[PDB]
Amino acid sequence: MAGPEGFQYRALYPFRRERPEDLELLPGDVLVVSRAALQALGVAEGGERCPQSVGWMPGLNERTRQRGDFPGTYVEFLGPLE
After folding, report:
1. Phi and psi (nearest 5°) for 37?
2. 81 phi and psi, to 5 degrees?
3. φ and ψ at 11, to 5 degrees?
């Protein structure tokens, strides 16, 4: 309606937080990321659809309700936040 507020990723494989400031990934669980975060990383418009090309990204996890940087290699792409 108004526009894309952000994008959603989804963890495919379970990996425990290596560091307290690391974000945990569980299979099937969704991670919510805003446009501001991706733009702060310097992502090209149409690159976010390939998270492994961006690397570690700051977002919100559903199962843990925690916030931090997750390795965007074990995650799939869901779509834009509208």
Report:
1. -60, -50
2. -80, 115
3. -70, 125
Strand 75-81 and strand 67-71: the pairing is: unpaired
Q: Measured between alpha carbons, how far is 31 from 48 in angstroms, rounded to an integer?
A: 13
Other beta carbons within 10 Å of 62: 15
| Cβ partners under 8 Å of residue 3, min gap 6 | 82
Residue type, 78: L
Q: How far apart are CA 26 and CA 4, in angstroms?
A: 25
Tokens standing for residue 63? 């199962």
Structure tokens at 36: 């501001």
Show the domains of the chain with their CATH numbers.
Answer: 1-82 (2.30.30.40)
Structure tokens at 14: 């379970």
Structural method: NMR
Whether 58 and 11 have beta carbons less than 8 Å apart is answered as: no
Residue 33 near residue 5 (C-beta atoms within 8 A): no
